[PDB]
Amino acid sequence: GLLDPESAHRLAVRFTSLGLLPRARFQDSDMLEVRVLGHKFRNPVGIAAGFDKHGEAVDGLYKMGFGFVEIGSVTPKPQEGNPRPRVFRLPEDQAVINRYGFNSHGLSVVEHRLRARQQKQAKLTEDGLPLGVNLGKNKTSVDAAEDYAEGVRVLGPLADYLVVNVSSPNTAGLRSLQGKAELRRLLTKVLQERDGLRRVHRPAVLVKIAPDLTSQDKEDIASVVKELGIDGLIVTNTTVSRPAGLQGALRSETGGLSGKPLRDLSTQTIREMYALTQGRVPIIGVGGVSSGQDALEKIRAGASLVQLYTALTFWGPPVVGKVKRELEALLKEQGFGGVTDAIGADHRR
Ligand SMILES: Cc1cc2nc3c(=O)[nH]c(=O)nc-3n(C[C@H](O)[C@H](O)[C@H](O)COP(=O)(O)O)c2cc1C
Numbered sequence: 001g002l003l004d005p006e007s008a009h010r011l012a013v014r015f016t017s018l019g020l021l022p023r024a025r026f027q028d029s030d031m032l033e034v035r036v037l038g039h040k041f042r043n044p045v046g047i048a049a050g051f052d053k054h055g056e057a058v059d060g061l062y063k064m065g066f067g068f069v070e071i072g073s074v075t076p077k078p079q080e081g082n083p084r085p086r087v088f089r090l091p092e093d094q095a096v097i098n099r100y101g102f103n104s105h106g107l108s109v110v111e112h113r114l115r116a117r118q119q120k121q122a123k124l125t126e127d128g129l130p131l132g133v134n135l136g137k138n139k140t141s142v143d144a145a146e147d148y149a150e151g152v153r154v155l156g157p158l159a160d161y162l163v164v165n166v167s168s169p170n171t172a173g174l175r176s177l178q179g180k181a182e183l184r185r186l187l188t189k190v191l192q193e194r195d196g197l198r199r200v201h202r203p204a205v206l207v208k209i210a211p212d213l214t215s216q217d218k219e220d221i222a223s224v225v226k227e228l229g230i231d232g233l234i235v236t237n238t239t240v241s242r243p244a245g246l247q248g249a250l251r252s253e254t255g256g257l258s259g260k261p262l263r264d265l266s267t268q269t270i271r272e273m274y275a276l277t278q279g280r281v282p283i284i285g286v287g288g289v290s291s292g293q294d295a296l297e298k299i300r301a302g303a304s305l306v307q308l309y310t311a312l313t314f315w316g317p318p319v320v321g322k323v324k325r326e327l328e329a330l331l332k333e334q335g336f337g338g339v340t341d342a343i344g345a346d347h348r349r
């Protein structure tokens with residue numbers, strides 16, 4: 001916290017990549033295993049997109065004890081992102097605001113990085129540690145569908161799941177892709193491209209949505225997802241809202257807000273999306289998770305898996321084991337046999 005947040009992030013990625021931090025001691029219980037999206041997940045706690053944008057620290061992140069890793073967002077061509085400053089800590093709120101704008105090494109660079117460890121990843125996936133790849137679009141793209149299609153073609157063969165990220169608040173016009181007609185067109189093309197890949201290279205496709213959607217938006221997304229047979233949802237990205245009560249000096253910076261102020265907004269979005277999809281569409285729940293309780297609330301709301309990022313920036317690597325240990329204890333306390341039993345449990349009350 002003695003460096004600016006962006007410099008701190010860069011060093012964190014570097015240290016993680018090099019495997020400098022200690023191997024996680026917490027051994028995952030059978031209670032934490034989830035089978036979803038055609039894969040086994042040794043535990044349901046993943047690293048959210050944005051920490052490892054360019055796929056530089058995948059192995060280090062598994063070493064940290066994450067049950068799955070999502071890299072990205074990756075754009076077709078390299079791009080620098082928005083001018084600095086573009087990331088801000090709100091310590092009083094346990095929150096971050098960012099406006100990176102999809103800084104990305106681009107598909108080619110990431111493709112080569114993942115190819116260098118493709119067989120290692122195949123073994124990790126087999127051993128219950130899958131890899132997700134989150135796709136974005138270039139700033140000056142005229143056809144968003146073509147950007148996402150290129151992402152499917154290039155990184156789809158290297159991923160257990162792909163994420164169509166239409167919910168960054170930091171790319172002009174992007175979140176209009178969540179609209180029914182735009183989303184149907186975009187996802188039809190994405191699924192067509194995915195279906196064209198050889199079977200062993202054919203990933204699940206998820207859509208990552210905003211926490212800022214209207215009821216109509218959410219109904220429309222649920223409809224499209226079901227119509228097209230989309231494999232899952234990631235719920236949610238950062239919020240452009242600024243909840244009453246934020247204390248951080250930097251609360252009025254432009255960008256997506258993450259961390260504790262997003263937590264319950266995200267949980268409620270999960271709850272709504274689960275109900276709108278009749279519990280038949282896997283949800284990865286993300287936003288403000290820093291404890292076992294936070295994880296379980298999202299799971300009971302309908303998430304099959306959870307992710308965190310912002311908590312890691314406050315609590316450091318120990319937060320991963322802490323979430324897992326606390327989640328295990330709570331499942332036992334509440335009479336669940338395991339994570340699987342708790343998924344969507346609130347809806348069966
Ligand atoms: C600095 C930063 C960068 C992010 N970059 C991305 C990104 O490139 N793609 C994406 O889909 N989400 C991105 N996110 C959103 C996270 O994946 C996550 O949805 C959100 O931060 C809520 O989780 P958290 O409260 O645990 O951080 C980013 C978040 C932060 C804080």
Ligand SMILES: O=C(O)c1cc(=O)[nH]c(=O)[nH]1
Nearest residue numbers: 100101102168170238256
């Ligand atoms: O600016 C980014 O790259 C970015 C930030 C964020 O919160 N979410 C996202 O999808 N991208």
Ligand SMILES: [Cl-]
Nearest residue numbers: 118157158201
């Ligand atoms: Cl390949």
